[PDB]
Amino acid sequence: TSDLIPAPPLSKVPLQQNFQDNQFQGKWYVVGLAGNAILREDKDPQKMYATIYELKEDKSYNVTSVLFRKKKCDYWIRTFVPGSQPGEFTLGNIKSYPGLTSYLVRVVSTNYNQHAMVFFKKVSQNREYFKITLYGRTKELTSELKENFIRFSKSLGLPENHIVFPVPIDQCIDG
Ligand SMILES: O=C(O)c1cccc(O)c1O
Ligand SMILES: O=C(O)c1cccc(O)c1O
Ligand SMILES: O=C(O)c1cccc(O)c1O
Ligand SMILES: [Cl-]
Ligand SMILES: [Fe+3]
């Protein structure tokens, strides 16, 4: 029902050159998060969660995000399939998600052992949603990388109340 900031043309979202799927694997913490249905919530700040990418034999990722919610560890699980050029992905078993007609992932940049920026886009009940995650191998990143992520999001038309920085926690996400 509610109006949405439109998705940007893909022409504005870079693709990472020579993507290495082996080195992008393992666990990443979500240290920055923006998108058109992401809202700053000062009363109740978003908490850091993690996303583990596991490379399978068939070259798909099995993908698990671990979050802390209502005193418990939640697990959100899905398969990312290699898309039309390397470092992009489509969603496996799209039909089994009600309302979902379109899903897209594009890794924007990464140095594989410190940080990454990734882009996501879905159509759900004919509404078009998008987000950008700032990832780290630890729960901390520098001012430089964070201002880099604020500039890139703003370049996609997101104002600053649609850009947030999950607070580090120890429950569920560690290992
Ligand atoms: O639906 C979720 O809980 C969720 C968790 C991690 C990452 C996502 O994109 C999600 O939609
Ligand atoms: O956010 C979602 O709706 C979603 C749907 C299907 C698969 C996913 O990984 C998601 O995050
Ligand atoms: O949560 C979201 O806003 C969202 C947006 C685009 C794609 C997703 O998977 C999401 O979870
Ligand atoms: Cl994520
Ligand atoms: Fe999602």
Author numbering: 4 to 178
What text appears in the publication on this structure?
The mammalian antibacterial protein siderocalin (Scn), also known as lipocalin 2 (Lcn2), neutrophil gelatinase-associated lipocalin (NGAL) or 24p3, functions by sequestering iron as bacterial siderophore complexes. Scn tightly binds a variety of bacterial siderophores including many catechol-based compounds from enteric bacteria, such as enterobactin (Ent; equilibrium dissociation constant (KD)  = 0.4±0.1 nM), but does not bind many hydroxamate-based siderophores, such as desferrioxamine (DFO). Iron transport by Scn requires the presence of a siderophore, since Scn has no measurable affinity for iron alone. The importance of Scn in antibacterial defense was demonstrated with Scn knock-out mice, which are profoundly susceptible to bacterial infections.
Since Fe(catechol)x complexes were readily observed binding in the Scn calyx by crystallography, Scn was co-crystallized in the presence of Fe(2,3-DHBA)3 and a 1∶3 mixture of iron and GA to mimic the 2,3-DHBA co-crystallization conditions. The Scn/Fe(2,3-DHBA)3 structure showed clear electron density for three 2,3-DHBA groups and bound iron in the calyx, while the Scn/Fe/GA structure showed only weak electron density features in the calyx consistent with water molecules and the unresolved side-chain of W79, despite ≥millimolar concentrations of protein and GA in the crystallization mix. For mixtures of iron and 2,3-DHBA, the Fe:L complex was predominant in solution and was successfully modeled in an association equilibrium with Scn (KD = 0.101±0.002 nM); the interaction between Scn and desferri 2,3-DHBA was more than a thousand-fold weaker (KD = 0.40±0.01 µM). At neutral pH, Ent and 2,3-DHBA chelate ferric ions in solution through the adjacent catechol 2-and 3-OH groups, generating complete, hexadentate FeEnt complexes or incomplete Fe(2,3-DHBA)x complexes. As the pH is lowered, iron binding shifts from catecholate-mode to salicylate-mode, engaging the 2-OH and carbonyl oxygens, and then to iron release. The shift from catecholate-to salicylate-mode binding is accompanied by an outward swing of the catechol groups, widening the ferric complex to a diameter that is also sterically incompatible with two of three pockets in the rigid calyx of Scn. Scn generally crystallizes at pHs in the 4 to 4.5 range. While this is below the release pH for catechol complexes, a partially-released complex was observed because of the high concentration of components and the very non-physiological conditions in the crystallization trials.
